[PDB]
Design a protein around this ligand. Sequence first.
Ligand SMILES: *[C@](O)([C@H](C)CO)[C@H](CC(C)C)NC(=O)[C@H](Cc1ccccc1)NC(=O)[C@H](CC(C)C)NC(=O)[C@H](CCc1ccccc1)NC(=O)CN1CCOCC1
Ligand SMILES: CC(C)C[C@H](NC(=O)[C@H](CCc1ccccc1)NC(=O)CN1CCOCC1)C(=O)N[C@@H](Cc1ccccc1)C(=O)N[C@@H](CC(C)C)[C@@H](O)[C@H](C)CO
Lengths: 125, 202, 238, 234, 245, 220, 213, 204, 217
Amino acid sequence: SRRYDSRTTIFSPEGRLYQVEYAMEAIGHAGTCLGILANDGVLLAAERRNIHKLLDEVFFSEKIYKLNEDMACSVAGITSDANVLTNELRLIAQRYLLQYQEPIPCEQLVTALCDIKQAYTQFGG
Amino acid sequence: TTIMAVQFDGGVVLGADSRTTTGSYIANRVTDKLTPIHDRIFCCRSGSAADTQAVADAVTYQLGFHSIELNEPPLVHTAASLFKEMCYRYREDLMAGIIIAGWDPQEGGQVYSVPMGGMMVRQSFAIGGSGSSYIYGYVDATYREGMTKEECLQFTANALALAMERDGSSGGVIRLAAIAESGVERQVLLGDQIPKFAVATL
Amino acid sequence: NQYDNDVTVWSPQGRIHQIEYAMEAVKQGSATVGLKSKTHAVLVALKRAQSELAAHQKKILHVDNHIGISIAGLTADARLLCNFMRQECLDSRFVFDRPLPVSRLVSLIGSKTQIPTQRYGRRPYGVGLLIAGYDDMGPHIFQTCPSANYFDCRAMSIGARSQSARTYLERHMSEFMECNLNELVKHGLRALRETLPAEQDLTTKNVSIGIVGKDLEFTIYDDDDVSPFLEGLEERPQ
Amino acid sequence: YDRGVNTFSPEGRLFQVEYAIEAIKLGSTAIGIQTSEGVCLAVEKRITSPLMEPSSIEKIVEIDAHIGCAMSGLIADAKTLIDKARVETQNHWFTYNETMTVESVTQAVSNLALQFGEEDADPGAMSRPFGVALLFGGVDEKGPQLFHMDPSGTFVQCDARAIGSASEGAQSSLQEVYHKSMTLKEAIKSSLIILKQVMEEKLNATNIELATVQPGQNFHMFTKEELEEVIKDI
Amino acid sequence: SSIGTGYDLSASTFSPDGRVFQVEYAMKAVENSSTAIGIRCKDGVVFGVEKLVLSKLYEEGSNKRLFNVDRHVGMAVAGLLADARSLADIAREEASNFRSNFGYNIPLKHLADRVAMYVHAYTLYSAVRPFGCSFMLGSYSVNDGAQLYMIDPSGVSYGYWGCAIGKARQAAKTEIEKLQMKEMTCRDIVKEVAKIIYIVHDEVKDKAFELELSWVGELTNGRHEIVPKDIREEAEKYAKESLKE
Amino acid sequence: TTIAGVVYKDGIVLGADTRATEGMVVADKNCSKIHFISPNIYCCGAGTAADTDMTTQLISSNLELHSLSTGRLPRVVTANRMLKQMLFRYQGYIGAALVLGGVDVTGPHLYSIYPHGSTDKLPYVTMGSGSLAAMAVFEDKFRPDMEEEEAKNLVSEAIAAGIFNDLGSGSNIDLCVISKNKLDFLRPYTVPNKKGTRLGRYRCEKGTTAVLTEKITPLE
Amino acid sequence: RFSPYVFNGGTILAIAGEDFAIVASDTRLSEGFSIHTRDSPKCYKLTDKTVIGCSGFHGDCLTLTKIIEARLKMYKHSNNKAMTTGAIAAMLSTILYSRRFFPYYVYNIIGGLDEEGKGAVYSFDPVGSYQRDSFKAGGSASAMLQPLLDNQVGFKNMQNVEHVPLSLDRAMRLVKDVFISAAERDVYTGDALRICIVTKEGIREETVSLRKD
Amino acid sequence: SIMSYNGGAVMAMKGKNCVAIAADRRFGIQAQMVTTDFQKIFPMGDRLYIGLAGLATDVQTVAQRLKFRLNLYELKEGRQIKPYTLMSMVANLLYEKRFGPYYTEPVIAGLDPKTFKPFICSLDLIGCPMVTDDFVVSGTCAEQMYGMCESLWEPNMDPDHLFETISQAMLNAVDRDAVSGMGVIVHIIEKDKITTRTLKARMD
Amino acid sequence: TQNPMVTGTSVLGVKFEGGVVIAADMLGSYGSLARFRNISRIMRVNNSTMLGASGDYADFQYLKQVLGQMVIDEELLGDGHSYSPRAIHSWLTRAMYSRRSKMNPLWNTMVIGGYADGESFLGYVDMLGVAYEAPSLATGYGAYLAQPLLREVLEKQPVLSQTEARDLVERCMRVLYYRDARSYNRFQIATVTEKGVEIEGPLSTETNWDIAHMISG
Ligand SMILES: *[C@](O)([C@H](C)CO)[C@H](CC(C)C)NC(=O)[C@H](Cc1ccccc1)NC(=O)[C@H](CC(C)C)NC(=O)[C@H](CCc1ccccc1)NC(=O)CN1CCOCC1
Ligand SMILES: CC(C)C[C@H](NC(=O)[C@H](CCc1ccccc1)NC(=O)CN1CCOCC1)C(=O)N[C@@H](Cc1ccccc1)C(=O)N[C@@H](CC(C)C)[C@@H](O)[C@H](C)CO
C-alpha cells in the first residue's frame, strides 16, 4: 500500500513539485494556443490537433469553450482533464450568478478554478 | 379477517377467509391469505395488507437463502423465528397478526402464533384476525386432541364459517391448505360448500 | 530486511518480525517481579533513574481495588493499556456491581492488543505487563506480551536481566504457596535484587511494592513505606 | 527505503520517536531547578539577528497562575501542547473548582505522546511525533515541583534538569551544584552561571529569559531590570 | 516451491505461478506450532493437545489451546495463539448471533462455513494479513450426529473423521489411521488420543509438555467439556505405558 | 379519477377517464392516465398526479434497464414488485393508486397496487374516486374469457359509470388493449361529453383594451 | 403516551457543625399510594469525608449514584488523591447540568468536611445549581423541615437570644425531632430515619424509628 | 393559505403562430401592497417565457435556480431549449422538493425555437405538468380566470385578437380578486418579435 | 415498546429459610381477552437465580433471550466465576433504565429471586429502572392485594420455612384470582435453594364460593 504510492503531492529536494513540472512537459506537446488583448475586443487562436480527413465536425469548436455569456476559454494539454475543468468552470460561474445576480468577474472565476488545481497539488495524493 | 391453523399427527391444516376491506368497502372479496414461505411452510396473514405482504416476502427471501446455505429442509420454528424477529423489532411500525404453520422432518407438524406484540408461542391450534373473537368459545368447546387430518379440516371449515357469518370484516370464500410430508393440498369452499347453521325463526 | 517493517507481513519462515521487535521493547525497561501465595498477590518493581537528580520512574499502577499492574516497556503504551483496564473494571462495576474477574480482564487485554497486529499501518503495543489481582478464585499473577499472548503464572519476571529473577523464582515456587505476606515480599525482593551486579543493591529510593489480597486492597508502597520490607533481609552473596 | 511511522527497530524502539529525540538536540538549552522556596526556569533565546525583536521569542510560557513551562526543540510543535495544557487546566477548574497538580498537567500533555499514525486514523490526526521537550515548573499542594517530558511521552519529576543542545554538560554542572536545600536565589544564580558557560553568545539581559513559581507568588516572568540585577552578581 | 521477489509481500498479490505466498507463510507458522489432534468416534468427538511448557513458572492450564466456542461446540487450535483466540471470539459471536436470530443451537457445518469465510476474507487484501493458525471444531447432537471440521489460514473448511495440525501432522495422521473410530467410543478414544500425543511428541528437541483433553458427545449430553482429571490421568498412564514397546 | 382493468381470453384491457382536478375545479379536461411501463406493460394511475407520473416513469426506466441487460421481454411480476416495494418504503406518503396490466411469457397479468404498497392479482380491478361504480359494472357484467371487443365494451362502460356518477371523474374514456401480439393504445376511445356551443360573440375588437406602455422587440 | 418519571418520595437533611456534618434521610420508598419498601435509606457514602443524600425518582437516584462512584474512582486514578468535598459538589453540578434537557429528577444534598476539617453542606437543584450551607433540607417534607432549622439553628426571628454554636448532640436531637414531626404530616416520610455523622474519626450510622402509616 | 399570502395571477394563451403570457404586478403582504412593479414573468431564452404565481420568495427562487440549470443546459448542449424540455426541467426541479415544496405554480408559454409551434403548459407546486391548446391559469383568482378564458378564447387568433382576449381575461378576472391586480403586464410573443405592454387597470 | 400488547399480570416473591419462592400465573392477556392461557412467565437464569415478569410478554421473551445468551457466554469460559443474583439484578436495572432513557422502554416489571453464598435474594426492577431489595415482593395488583398479606406475616415472623412461604404464596394467588380480573386459575411456582432452581408445573387454586348464597340475609 505504501509501496505502490507514487507520492504525487510531495516536495522534491530542490523544493519543487515534480508532477506539476511533468504536467507542464505534457502541455508542451499539446497544440499551440495563444490569445491577444485589444482595445475593442480580445481573441483566442489555437492550433487544431483533431485534423483528419474522416472527422465529422459536429461541434462549434474543438479547443474553444464558452464558460459564461461574458466569458470563454481555450485549453492546452490532456483534453479530458480540460473537459472536467471547463465543466467545473461553468458550474462556478452559474453559482456566482445564482448568488449575486450578476456575472462573475473573470479573475474571480480564474482564481476559483486555480484554488481547485492548487488543492490537487497540495493534498489528496 | 379471520385465520386459523390446527395441528394433527403428520402435519397441519390452515384456513382463512378471503375478505379484504378498506373502510366498509370490500377491496377484495377473494383474497389469498395463506401465503407459502417454503415448500412445506405456510403463514396466515391478518392486519395491514401491505405490512403482512412485505414481511412475508422478506421472510421468504431470508428463509430461502438460509435453507440453501444449510442444504436442509427449513425448520418451521425457524420461519416463525424470522417472522418473530421482524414483527418484534418493528412492532411500533407494523400491524401484523401472523400464524406460521407447516411440516418439518425434525418436529413434524407445527403451528406458531405471532400476534401484534411480536411474541411467539407454539399452540395445538391457533386463531387470529378480527373474526377470531367470535369463535373463541366454539373453538374451545369443539377442540379434541388426536383429531384426524379430515377432522381438523372440517373443524377449521366450521369455525371459519361461523366467524365469517358473524364478523363483517370477514367473509367471501373459505381457503384451506393441508400440509404434511406428502405435500400441500389446497382447496376452496364456496357458496353451498361453506357450512351452514340453523338461524332462529319464530 | 524486506519483512521487517510491517506487522501484516509474514516472513517466509512463518514469523512476524515487527511483533518480535515489539517484544524486544519489554527487555529495554527495568526488571520487575510478581508472585502469589495463597492469600496475597505481590508485585515488586525496580524503579530506574536517569540521573541522580531525577526521581525514579513509576512502575506500579492502580487499576481497581482488587487489581494492580507492573509495567515494562513504553510508558505511553503502558498508560494506554492501564486506562483501558481501568475503564473495563469501572464498566464491570457499573453494570454488575461486582468486581471484574482478573482472568476476564486479561482476556480483554489479549483481544484488544491482538487487533493492531493484523492491520496495515498499525503496530503492536510496546509494553509487557505483570497483573496482580484477587477474586473468588484467589490471588492471580498474569503476564501480557506485545504479541497479545497472556500467561497465568505462579511467579514471573520481565525485563532487563530478568533471567536471574526467573531462575530464582523457579527454585522457590514450592515455598511460595504457604508463605505469609512478609516472606512473600521477601522472596520477591530477592528475585528482584538477583538482577543486579554486586556493586549495587535494593534501596528505599529505587524499589516499589504493590500488594493485593483477601485482607487488603491493592496498595502501593514507594519510599519510607518500603523500609519495613527491606529491613529484614539477608546481606546477599558476591 | 521508506517505512511506516509506527515501525519498530530490532532494538525495540519507534524510529520516529528516536528521531524526534535526535531533533531535540538542536534546540535552545533550558534549565529548571526545584527548590522548597520555588521553581525556576531559565532559557537562552538564540537571537540570530540584531533586527529580530527578542521579546517575541518566548520559550517560557504560563500554563496557569501556578504552572509555567519551558520548551526546547521545534517550538511550533510546542505551541499546540501548551494550548492543550492551558485548556486542560481550565477544564479541570471548571469541573472541580480547584487547581491542577503539576503532575496531572504534565501527564495530560504526555497523553498526546504516541498519538500519531497513518491508516485506521482520523483525517486530522497527527502524522508524526512532537519534536520538542518540556519542563513543567509549578507549585501545588505538594509544594514546588519540576517535571520533564520528551517525545516518548515518558514524563518524570526532577530536582534539577537541563534540556537542549548543551544537555549533558549543563546536567553535569547541575549535579555539581545541587543539594536538596538551596535557596531560590542560589538556584537562579546557578542556572544563569551554567547558562553563561554553555551559551556561545555573551549572556546578557536580552539574551535569555528566566521565570519563577513560588508558594506565595504567582508565575512571574523576570523583567529586563530584574534580569540585570541577577546578572549583576555574575 | 520458493519464489520471493516482491511477489510474497502481500495477499493482494499473486505469484507468477499463481500462488499467494502470505497464506502459505501463515501455514508455515501453523507448522512450527506444537501438534494438536482431534478424532471423531461414533458417539462424539475427542480433542487432544500437546501444550508445550515454556517455563515451570507458568500455572497449570495456562495458554489453553482448547476453547469453548459454544455449549455444544469445542475448538482446538494450532499456531499463533493470539490469532487463535481472536478466531475463537469470532466463532463464539457467530454462534451467539445464530442463536439470537434463528432460535436454536448452530449446526457445526454452518459455523465452520461462516468462520472459514471470515478467515478467507483475510487472504485477499494488503490491508490485512492472513490468520496464523489452523483450528478444529468438534460437536455432537442426536438430530445432527458427531461432527469434526477443520479450517486452515486460507479459509478452507473440511469434515474429518480424524485430523491433526502442527509439527508432526503426518506423523500423527499415520497413527490415527490405525484406529477404527467408526466403531469405537469416545471413552476408549481418549486413551488412544493421549497415546498418539505421547508418540508424536519429541522429548529431545522439545522440553516438557502438558496434555490437554476435550469431550463432546452422547456421554456429555451434547455439551463440550474438559476431560475429568481421573480419565485424563488414566489416559496418560496408558500412554506412558504404551511408550515402552 | 376512475381507472379500471380487465383480463380476457387473449389479454388485457385497461381503462381510464381524463379529468384532473385541483380543489373542486376541473384543471385538466384531457389527462392521459394510462402510462407506458414497457412495450408489453401499461399502468393506469389514480391519486396524486405528480406521484403517479414520477413513480410510473421511474419504474418504466428501471424496467428498460432490466430488459436491456436481460435481453428478454419484461415480466409483470417485476413491475409489480418494484412498484409495491418502492411504495411500501414510503409508507403511503406517495399518493399513487395503480392498475398494472401486461402480457408476459406466462400470459396476461393484472394487478391493483395501493399507495401503501399492497397488491392484489385479480381478473378485474378498479381504482380511483369512481372505482365503486366501475366495480359495480364489473360485478354485474363480467364473465371469464371474454372476446376483445366485448371486454373493451365492458371496461369503457365501467369508466363511463365512473365518469357520470363520480364528481371526481369526467370527460373522455381512454383504453389500452394488450394481447400476446398487439398493442392498441386507443387514445380518445370515446368522447361521451362535449362542451356546449357558444351562443354569442364576445370577441373583443382591436382597440378596446386601453394601454399605458408598449415596447416592441425584434428577434431572428 | 409514556412517562420516564415517577416520584418515589423521600426526605433529606444535612447540617454542618464546626467539626462534624450530619446527613440524614427517611427510609421509605413509595410509588403512587403504595409502599415499595421500608428499608431504603437515601444516604450514600462517597468518601471518608463525604456523604451524599439523593431523593426523588429512584431510577435517577441509583444511576446518578453509580455515576458519582465511577467518577470518584476515575479522579482517584487521575490525580492520586481523593476528591475533596467541594470538588465533588462542583463535579455533581456539571454532571447534573449535562442533562439540562433531560434532567435527573433528583434532589441532592452533600454533607461532609472541608480541607480545614470544618463541616460543610452543599444543596443542589435537579439541574446543577448548588450552594454552600450550614443546614439544608430537601425532598418531599423539605418545607416542613426548613422553617424550624431557620429558627433553631439560624436563630431567626428571635429577640435577645444567644448565638451558641450547634453541638453534635443538639443537632442530632434536632434531626430526630424534625423527622418525627415530618412523619406526622408528610405521607411520603416514615418507617425509619437513618442518620450519618461525619467527623475526623469517620462515618457513624444511626437508625431511629418512625411511624409506619 | 400559504399561496394567498402574497396573491397574484398568471395566465397563458395560445394563438395562430403566436403565444401570450400575462401577470398582475402587485407585490403585497397579506392585505398591504408593498410594490406595484413586481416581476412575475421571466424570459428563459428567446421566444420562451415562464410565469410564476404564488409565494413571492419561491417565485424568485424557482426562477433563479431554473435559470441556473437552464444556462448550464444551453452551455453543455449547443442549442436553445425546447418548450417541452423546459417543462420537464421545471417539473424535476419542483418534484425534488416533493415533501417540502416551493409554493408556486409555474406557467410556461413559448414557441418552438426550431419550428415556431406555439406551446403552453402549467405545473403543480410539486411539478406535475399539464399541456393545453387553449389557455392555462395559476393564481389566487384561478376560478375567475377560468371563467373569462372559457368564454373569450377562440382557436386561431392573430397577434392582435390574442392580446385583446388575454388582456380582457386578466383584467376582468383580477378585478374580482382583492389580492391580485395593481396593474397587468402582457407579453405577446411571435416568431419575428416580442411585444410587451402594461394595461390600464384599476389600482385598488 | 410504547403500547403493550399481550401481557401478564402479578408476580409474587418471598424469601424463606435457605431459599426464595416466586409465583406467577400462566396467562397472556390481549386486553380483557385471556388469549394465551398456557405460557411460562418464569425463567431460570442459571442455578443461583430466577426471574418472574409482569407486563408485555414479547419484551419478556426478548430479555429471556438476552439473559440466556449472557449465561451461556459466561458458562463457556468456565473460569470459576458466575453471575450472582445481585449481579443479574444490577444488570437488569441498568438495562431497563437504559431503555427508559432512550424513551423506548421494555414494558416489564420484574422480580428476581435467588440463593447464593447462603443468603436469600429478592429484587424488584421497574420499566423505568426503579430497583430495590425486599423480603417480599408483589407486582401489579399483587402490590395492592398480596403484598399487604405478606408484610403482615413477615413483620410478625421474619423467618419462614419453605412450606410456610409456599402456603402464603398459595393463599395470595387465591386472593389475586378472586380480585384480579386479568388473572387466571393456573399458575407456576419457582424455587431457589442450594440444590438449584425448580419450577413446578401447572397448579390450580381451590376456590370457595359460599358467599354466593348470601344475597338475601
Ligand atoms: C383483515 O384483517 C380483516 C378482514 C379485518 O380487518 C383484513 C385482511 C388483510 C390481510 C388484507 N385487513 C384489512 O382489510 C385492512 C385494515 C387496515 C386498515 C388500516 C391500516 C391497516 C389495516 N385494509 C387495508 O389494509 C387496505 C388495503 C387495500 C386498500 C385493499 N388499506 C387500508 O385499510 C388503508 C390504510 C392506509 C393508511 C391510512 C391512514 C394512515 C396510515 C395508513 N385505510 C384507508 O382508509 C384507505 N383509504 C383512505 C380512506 O378511504 C378509503 C381508502
Ligand atoms: C391539476 C393537476 C395537474 C394536478 C392536481 N394537483 C394538485 O391539486 C396540487 C396538489 C399538490 C400536493 C402536495 C402535497 C401532497 C399532495 C398533493 N395542488 C396545487 O398544485 C396547488 N394547490 C396548493 C394549495 O391549494 C390547493 C392546491 C392533482 O393532483 N389532482 C389529483 C387529485 C388530488 C389528490 C390528492 C391530493 C391532491 C390532488 C387528480 O387529478 N387525481 C386524478 C388522478 C390522476 C391525476 C392520475 C384522480 O384521481 C381523479 C381526477 C380524481 O381527482
